[PDB]
Design a binder for this molecule. Structure first.
Ligand code: AGS
Ligand code: AGS
Ligand code: AGS
Ligand code: AGS
Ligand code: MG
Ligand code: MG
Ligand code: MG
Ligand code: MG
Lengths: 252, 164, 495, 327, 319, 255
DNA sequence: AGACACTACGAGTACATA
DNA sequence: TTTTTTTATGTACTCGTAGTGTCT
């Protein structure tokens, strides 16, 4: 029997809306540390994982770890009924054939429960052991969303180049944006950091990046880890955990 | 107005120039027009089905009857003439005919009630009912059976076997 | 708890499914061909699919599998994909598959690698193609079809792809499946052999504590008509009550599990024109109700197929004192009566309740009148192509008549029957006798009735019999034709 | 006012006691509604037998004067598709009544014109919602209804109205109207009805209008025959006798004068001669085969038009050639 | 008249598989399957009113126990069953997680499966193949030919046959014992005769006769229920003399209110399903019946046309 | 004769918008007290009853009780051709005939005279809502609309439960199950947000969602929806106009 | 004030028909 | 062993410009 309580439903609503279009079914594991959930795209090209710890929950009770396989469309329809001023509460019993989303209002006597029926998903939970990424850079998420929206309107394939402490986002008419790593003390949020080991050459699609950049609402800074023989990792920070995206490159 | 119509009739073919305007001009079809004249004084005109060889005066008889009933003023407002040159499928019968039958009868003027009987019902005539499909014909059944208080149906055909 | 599976909870179909390629029953040639085609896929891609080997596989970047349902196409494809070290991306008709949907979801995977191949295995490089995709599209024949739909999108995707594209369907010779005629390597899974299915049945029988003799498996297969899945389901369904079926209860089992499948528009022609069916013994076995259901299997081609090849058989039901010509004439009379009935059916008032009658007059009676042996081969109905040709010629003649109405003042038929025998000698004949200096006369003649070059070319195609211009136009010297077509695009013509 | 409705509509039965002809069905329906056990009804019968009147009077007896609101009446005039079923009929069956307490009644009048998909969707609506609503299907042809839908309702066959019931209704009308009717005229009226009350009422109104008097006289057979344009048995038998006995020219002249003096139709004469020759006891059935075949062919040709004189001569020649074998 | 009672077809509707008097083989098969579990995909076909829907309902009920409400998805022909429904709702139910006993499975009952569109039937293939370990499909139809072969290949085929006079008589005797109704042997025989292997029609006619006359007698049964339509038509067509067939057509069919279209359709069906005469004679009779039907449909439907049809049939039978 | 001159134009427009796609054939009755109209749904499940007194009109004159029947589609078509700044005037002759809808502008001489031909509907005017109700309640329009169109996405049926000082809306479907529990409370600084409830016996009854989604469309007229429920009684959904009232009688489902 | 997700009424395309 | 066919109402699916309530 798990019982978790947020401070406001807006946090979980935005967390779900960040990746609501890349996957339809997702397995939320529940341990004593927190909630971890990874979901692979229907085309198996984009893997979206997330981890939220106890710091984001007002109350957290998880006696035993349990995996809840739930859809995102029905969960979105359910969460759309809740208000931003309500205290969301996720409740689950033993053998959780369903999950209760309880909305409490603090200044009115209104209690809105929504019981959602979980799915039976093949939980092939792959390990996320750390791989030494060749390049690890970080830049604000808003400019990332803008540049991806810019290159998306020109073509579908987007090539990323990490070379000689320079970042290149090129779309093949043919457009190109070149980024320099400059650290600013007066504005620590726009500090575009970069640690490069090998020059990396990656190539992704349009729709995947367009759906990844829509999650640029939880963190003002996104970290990009790239390797020639490993999928790119786009990490967005949270108040307690983090939301990572794993995107596969294109052929050469 | 009247003189223009007289001149137009005088400059029309003899078939249309000498078309019977009253129920007295019909010469040989006396059995039907006798009932049509006797029901003109009453108000219980039933649903009628004219059938026979072509050129016997069915359309002329129904036109003369509607005229003698409603006058040249209500002749254009209390009639619904549906010929074979129009669409008469299930859709037409269900929408247009049923909406006209469900309508209330138009109020007669002061000059209408003084010279004409002005019955409390209207007439929906369907000329050349041979071309009407059997389903569109069966659709007319309850349409004519329930709204008989406000409308009256007059089918006209040559082969009575073509009607269900 | 959830991962714990129970063998008494799985069907005999899935609990005994093949786990390796060596367990598939029959059709070894097709499975081996698919394996060789998928093994040599990257080697072909390296040379832009130009190099071709002795197997003939390597020029087609995509493969299609077609056959009856339940013979192991999907299982074979999946097993080959798993044994060749590839990542399976399987989609089918159960998921939304349209043009827009395929462009959104699948189109972004024809040139992009997988994302789980990295997470699966990276420490040991077993094969370089482990990071590659295989697109197994099952139930291709279940798409919407038409001008707009995912069928054409997949047909065009089959031309430009960097990942193997396997297609699985149950019906190949379909109009919607027409774009796939020359773009992918077609493999046909046929009726499996009785020996492999017999061995598999013996195995699943001794495993399930079920008694079975090998003498019944042949009958089971021939009543099932090549579907191991239905045989397995039959065994699982009847084994729960009867634990032994050798020669006693097989009659009712076969009579209760007979496959009621619709015959192709060519098999209906064979069964309809079968003389044994209309015999005194065959009549009480294949009753008239079955003969009418035969027509009702496909009521759009059965009358045409009957009328096409009813006079191309050797009758064996000829009554004493009746020749073949008399039976053919009676069959043709009944064909005309069925024609009248069909015209009354597909006309106004929608008299479709006369469809059973059209069954007898158009198909059953003419076949019964001429039933017997097939002399040659069952010819496809040529009435459709002739109707299309006549419609095209009627359109052309209508254009010609509407062009020359300003001068002829006659009807379409009145111009085809009367004007063309003179228009031919006015336009074409001066070319055969006067060389290339009769060009001005022909131009003036075609101008006087507002004719065109395309109209001139279409006019000469209507004549038949002893007057065919298909060789006369070739007999004309090319210089004369060149001068004519050059003068056409030079002089102005008043429409 | 009701005095403006036609006689077919004015004399529509409002209670189950005014529905004549059907006694085995009416009594069983009354017992059904009295004991409460009312199953799904299927009133199958020819036109003008009193199915719609019966079900309307039944709904009136069940719900009172509130019939038009507690009953869902659908007919061919209304759009009846599969979506119409799914929405309207299912929502009417699933919910409760708005004005009182009791089961609901869905009167699918003329349901022989419904689509096969509509019946396939309705056959499970009848079986699922069967504790709070009922279904009554009216039909003239039982072949247009699927056997699945046909097996869920109790079938009541409305027989054609017999002599006694039509005579009783005629007497009721003659009491309601200032009208007198002759006995032989009444018999002829029964003969040209085939159990159709609509035809009887229509021709009765027409003969009352034909009287041309303040109705101080009686309606005789002549008035009826001149009203419906039907041939008299006298002229019928005279034409038949002239055909069977007289010469070709004499029979032709007799047929011409009979059909031109009274303005009779050839189809009516054909039907009358067929009805008369049905009682004729003849020799070997070949003559009957020829007669029936040729007369049906001539009737089918008349049903499409043509030359009336040629068809009359064809009738004469066909009858003569048929009776030429009975020797 | 304030409230009504449930009909005997719904009141005495079987709720256990033992109360079904249908085909003993398939009923015992379903009983053993529900007792052991592991119910496979099935397609039950037959004629109306023989116990197909009740059979699968009893199977699902006895197999799921109290979890019937949350484990059974019932979809009839009255509900939308297009490609969109199969894509969304059926797939959501098949993917829905439910903790069931270790011998049961979620059941998807699809009544009138012969009415589903081709797209939905095609989409259901992988839907039933990918979740065959936690979701089972039971189709109930009247014509197995309307369901595509790919769907039939993944399930068992149960063809229900007509109910013999013994089974219907036993069920009627059980209903009478449970209702305490005065009956007679000839009345029950007439009920079985007019039922034609239709149990539902038999129970309906029995209830009608009981509530209309009180005593189940052959006289009352024949008075409230007319003789079967196809049998009188068969007797008319099989007549040896033209006069006998004409008298039958006049008295039994025409004088009782049977329309000409129904008569000609029943004649066509009887001649098609006839077995007494040869194939050629049946073909000529069907040809003449269709020639007559072509005139009946044009509005020329009268007694003279049927008389001419009978005369032509007798002339054909006159060698 | 009949003369009903409104003060504005959009009033009748919103009045007809309240049940535009809800019913089809209406039969207005104009008497000395005001216009009253009851209309049954096509499926005979709900009854719309509207009553506008002589308060909402600028001028009202009715000699004898007149009955005008009309289809809502043609009435909507006629009303859409009128400008929102015009003045509406319903006119009827001595005998009931085609109603004259007159649009008269206030600044320019714009006389838009439409004539809507009447229907002949069976005037089966009954007397309803004269029965005692087991439970009565009242709550804001926006809250009811939100709850209805939020529970309509989870199921097609909505079960309302009135227990001792407890209101409950339950929606049990296939993809999920929702339940909203509002409690009676009366505020003083905002007297319009109060949710009043007078219950005598517990009520448990289900309705359809396709009909509640059309009932909530009437929330554009008023802001305090009243709901009257009882065992075997039509659910009364009342919107209170400034002159009359618009009440929907919904039929509960059969459990 | 406005942009854009949600959405429901409408034109086009086929697909059967006992 | 293989291609096509006029029309008529009911059914189902699809894209889709459009009308309006809502959030950055
Ligand atoms: N009984 C009649 N008395 C006088 N003139 C007649 C009579 N019948 C026909 N006519 C003449 O014939 C013309 C045609 O009359 P119609 O009523 O159109 O004939 P019809 O019966 O309608 O034939 P159709 O339309 O082909 S079925 C009339 O305008 C008259 O001039
Ligand atoms: N050759 C075979 N040998 C053994 N089992 C087989 C064979 N073919 C089919 N099966 C069984 O049938 C099951 C399903 O086979 P599938 O390959 O999915 O059928 P299919 O040939 O693809 O036809 P579909 O699904 O209608 S397109 C397998 O899991 C096996 O249990
Ligand atoms: N048994 C009857 N007793 C008295 N009047 C009858 C009877 N049957 C018919 N009528 C009269 O005929 C009129 C029409 O009856 P309906 O019940 O409408 O005919 P029907 O049986 O429904 O056949 P349809 O409508 O053509 S399918 C009634 O209004 C009565 O005036
Ligand atoms: N074997 C049986 N034993 C007892 N009652 C039966 C039997 N078969 C049918 N019935 C009765 O018939 C009623 C309806 O049976 P159904 O199963 O609905 O008919 P069906 O076989 O499904 O054919 P359909 O539904 O028309 S396709 C049941 O409620 C029972 O009252
Ligand atoms: Mg005319
Ligand atoms: Mg497969
Ligand atoms: Mg009727
Ligand atoms: Mg059933």
């Amino acid at each position: 029997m798990l019982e978790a309580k947020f401070e406001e439903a807006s946090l979980f609503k935005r967390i779900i809306d960040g990746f609501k279009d890349c996957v339809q079914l997702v397995n939320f594991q529940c341990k004593e540390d927190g909630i971890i959930a990874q979901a692979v795209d229907d085309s198996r090209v984009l893997l979206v994982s997330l981890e939220i710890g106890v710091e984001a929950f007002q109350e957290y009770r998880c006696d035993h770890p349990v995996t809840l396989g739930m859809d995102l469309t029905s969960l979105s329809k359910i969460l759309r009924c809740g208000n931003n001023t309500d205290t969301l509460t996720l409740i689950a019993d033993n053998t959780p054939d369903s999950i209760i989303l309880l909305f409490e209002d603090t200044k009115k006597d209104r209690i809105a429960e929504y019981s959602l029926k979980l799915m039976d998903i093949d939980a092939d939970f792959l390990k996320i052991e750390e791989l030494q990424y060749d390049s690890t850079l970080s830049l604000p998420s808003s400019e990332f969303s803008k540049i991806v929206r810019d290159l998306s309107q020109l073509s579908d394939s987007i090539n990323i180049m990490i070379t000689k402490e320079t970042i290149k986002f090129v779309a093949d008419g043919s457009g190109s944006v070149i980024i320099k790593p400059f650290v600013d003390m007066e504005h620590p949020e726009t500090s575009i950091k970069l640690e490069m080991d090998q020059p990396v050459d990656l190539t992704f699609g349009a729709k995947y990046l367009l759906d990844i950049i829509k999650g640029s609402s939880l963190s003002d800074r996104v970290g990009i880890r790239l390797s020639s023989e490993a999928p790119a990792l786009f990490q967005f920070d949270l108040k307690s955990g983090f939301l990572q995206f794993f995107l596969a490159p294109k052929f050469n | 107005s009247k003189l223009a119509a007289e001149q137009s009739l005088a400059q029309q073919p003899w078939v249309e120039k000498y078309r019977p305007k009253n129920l007295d001009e019909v010469t040989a079809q006396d059995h039907a027009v006798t009932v049509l004249k006797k029901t003109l004084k009453s108000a219980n005109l039933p649903h009628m089905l004219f059938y026979g060889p072509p050129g016997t005066g069915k359309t002329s008889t129904i036109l003369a009857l509607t005229k003698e009933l409603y006058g040249p003023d209500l002749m254009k407002s209390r009639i619904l003439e549906l010929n074979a040159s129009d669409e008469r499928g299930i859709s037409i019968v269900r929408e247009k005919v049923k909406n006209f039958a469900r309508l209330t009868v138009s109020k007669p003027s002061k000059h209408d009630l003084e010279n004409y009987p002005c019955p409390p019902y209207k007439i929906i005539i369907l000329d050349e009912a041979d071309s009407m499909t059997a389903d569109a014909q069966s659709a007319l059944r309850r349409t004519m059976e329930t709204y008989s208080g406000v409308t009256r149906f007059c089918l006209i055909c040559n082969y009575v076997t073509r009607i269900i | 708890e959830r991962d714990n599976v129970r063998e008494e909870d799985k069907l005999w179909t899935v609990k005994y499914a093949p786990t390796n390629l060596q367990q598939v029953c029959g059709n070894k040639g097709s499975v081996m061909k698919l394996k060789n085609w998928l093994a040599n896929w990257e080697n072909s891609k390296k040379n832009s699919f130009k190099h071709a080997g002795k197997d003939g596989s390597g020029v087609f970047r995509a493969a299609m599998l077609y056959g009856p349902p339940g013979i192991g196409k999907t299982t074979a494809a999946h097993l080959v994909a798993q044994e060749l070290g590839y990542d399976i991306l399987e989609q089918n008709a159960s998921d939304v598959r349209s043009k827009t949907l395929l462009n959104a979801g699948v189109k972004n995977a024809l040139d992009n690698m997988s994302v789980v191949g990295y997470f699966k295995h990276n420490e040991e490089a077993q094969n370089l193609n482990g990071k590659h995709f295989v697109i197994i599209m099952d139930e291709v024949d279940g798409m919407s079809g038409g001008d707009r739909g995912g069928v054409g999108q997949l047909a065009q995707f089959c031309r430009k792809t960097s990942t193997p594209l396997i297609l699985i369907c149950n019906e190949r010779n379909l109009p919607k499946m027409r774009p796939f005629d020359r773009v992918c390597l077609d493999i046909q899974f046929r009726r499996p052999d009785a020996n492999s299915i017999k061995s598999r049945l013996m195995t699943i029988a001794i495993r399930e504590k079920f008694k079975l003799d090998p003498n019944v498996i042949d009958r089971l297969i021939q009543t099932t008509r090549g579907d191991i899945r239905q045989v397995i389901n039959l065994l699982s369904t009847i084994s729960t009550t009867t634990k032994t079926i050798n020669h006693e209860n097989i009659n009712e089992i076969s009579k209760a599990w007979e496959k009621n499948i619709a015959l192709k528009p060519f098999d209906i022609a064979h069964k309809m024109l079968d003389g044994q069916i209309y015999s005194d013994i065959g009549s009480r076995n294949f009753t008239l109700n079955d003969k009418i259901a035969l027509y009702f299997d496909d009521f759009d081609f059965t009358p045409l197929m009957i009328q096409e090849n009813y006079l191309s058989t050797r009758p064996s039901v000829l009554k004493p004192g009746q020749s073949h010509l008399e039976a053919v004439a009676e069959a043709a009379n009944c064909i005309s009566l069925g024609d009248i009935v069909e015209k009354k059916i597909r006309s106004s008032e929608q008299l479709w309740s006369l469809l059973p009658l059209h069954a007898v007059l158009s198909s059953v009676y003419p076949a019964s009148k001429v039933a017997g042996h097939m002399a040659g081969r069952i010819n496809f109905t040529a009435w459709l192509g002739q109707n299309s040709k006549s419609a095209k010629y009627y359109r052309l003649l209508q254009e010609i008549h509407y062009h020359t109405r300003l001068g002829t003042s006659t009807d379409k038929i009145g111009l085809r029957l009367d004007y063309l025998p003179t228009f031919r000698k006015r336009l074409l004949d001066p070319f055969l006798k006067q060389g290339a200096d009769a060009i001005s006369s022909v131009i003036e003649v075609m101008d006087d009735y507002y004719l065109t070059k395309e109209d001139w070319d279409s006019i000469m195609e209507f004549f038949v019999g002893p007057d065919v211009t298909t060789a006369i136009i070739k007999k004309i010297p090319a210089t004369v034709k060149s001068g004519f077509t050059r003068k056409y695009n030079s002089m102005t013509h008043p429409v | 006012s009701k005095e403006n409705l036609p006689w077919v509509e004015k004399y529509r039965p409002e209670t189950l006691d005014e529905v004549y002809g059907q006694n085995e069905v009416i009594t069983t329906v009354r017992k059904f509604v009295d004991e409460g056990k009312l199953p799904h009804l299927l009133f199958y019968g020819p036109p003008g037998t009193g199915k719609t009147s019966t079900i309307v009077a039944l709904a009136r007896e069940i719900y009172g004067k509130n019939y038009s609101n507690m009953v869902l009446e659908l007919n061919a005039s209304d759009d009846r598709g599969i979506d119409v079923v799914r929405n309207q009929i299912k929502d009417f069956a699933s919910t409760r009544q708005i004005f009182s307490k009791g089961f609901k009644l869905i009167i699918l009048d003329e349901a022989d014109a419904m689509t096969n998909a509509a019946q396939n969707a309705l056959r499970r609506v009848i079986e699922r919602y069967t504790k709070n609503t009922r279904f009554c299907v009216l039909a003239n042809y039982a072949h247009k209804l699927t056997p699945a839908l046909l097996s869920r309702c109790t079938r009541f066959r409305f027989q054609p109205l017999p002599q006694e019931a039509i005579e009783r209704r005629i007497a009721n009308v003659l009491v309601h109207e200032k009208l007198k009717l002759s006995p032989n005229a009444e018999k002829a009226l029964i003969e040209l009805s085939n159990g159709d009350m609509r035809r009887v009422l229509n021709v009765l109104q027409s003969c009352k209008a034909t009287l041309d008097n303040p109705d101080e006289d009686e309606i005789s057979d002549d008035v009826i025959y001149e009203c419906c344009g039907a041939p008299r048995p006298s002229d019928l038998k005279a034409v038949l006798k002239s055909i069977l006995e007289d010469d070709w020219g004499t029979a032709h002249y007799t047929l011409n004068k009979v059909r031109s003096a009274k303005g009779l139709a050839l189809i009516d004469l054909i039907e009358g001669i067929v009805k008369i020759l049905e009682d004729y006891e003849l020799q070997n059935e070949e003559t009957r085969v020829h007669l029936l075949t040729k007369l049906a062919d001539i009737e089918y040709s008349i049903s499409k038009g043509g030359n009336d004189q040629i068809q009359g001569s064809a009738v004469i020649g066909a009858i003569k050639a048929s009776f030429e074998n009975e020797t | 008249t304030l409230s009504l009672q449930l009909p005997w077809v719904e009141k005495y509707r079987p709720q256990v598989l033992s109360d079904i008097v249908g085909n003993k083989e398939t009923i015992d098969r379903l009983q053993q399957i529900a007792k052991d579990g592991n119910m496979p995909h099935m397609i039950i076909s037959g004629m109306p009113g023989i116990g197909k829907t009740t059979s699968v309902h009893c199977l699902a009920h006895e197999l799921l126990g109290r979890s019937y409400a949350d484990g059974v998805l019932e979809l009839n022909a009255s509900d939308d069953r297009g490609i969109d429904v199969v894509r969304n709702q059926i797939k959501h139910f098949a993917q829905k997680k439910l903790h069931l006993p270790p011998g049961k499975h979620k059941i998807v009952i699809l009544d009138e499966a012969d009415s589903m569109t081709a797209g939905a039937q095609q989409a259901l293939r992988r839907t039933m193949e990918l979740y065959s370990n936690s979701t089972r499909f039971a189709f109930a139809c009247n014509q197995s030919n309307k369901i595509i072969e790919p769907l039939q290949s993944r399930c068992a085929i149960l063809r229900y046959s007509k109910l013999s006079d013994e089974d219907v008589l036993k069920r009627l005797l059980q209903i009478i014992k449970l209702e305490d109704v005065k009956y007679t042997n000839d009345g029950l025989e007439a009920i079985i005769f007019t039922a034609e292997g239709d149990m539902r029609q038999a129970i309906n006619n029995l209830q009608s006769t009981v509530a209309g006359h009180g005593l189940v007698n052959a006289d009352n049964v024949f008075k409230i229920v007319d003789s079967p339509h196809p049998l009188i038509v068969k007797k008319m067509l099989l007549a040896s003399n033209l006069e006998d067939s004409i008298q039958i057509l006049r008295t039994d069919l025409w004088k009782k209110g049977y329309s000409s279209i129904d008569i000609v359709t029943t004649s066509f069906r009887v001649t098609k399903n006839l077995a007494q005469v040869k194939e050629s004679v049946r073909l000529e009779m069907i040809k003449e019946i269709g020639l007559t039907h072509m005139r009946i449909l044009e509005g020329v439907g009268t007694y003279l046309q049927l008389a001419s049809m009978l005369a032509k049939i007798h002339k054909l039978n006159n060698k």
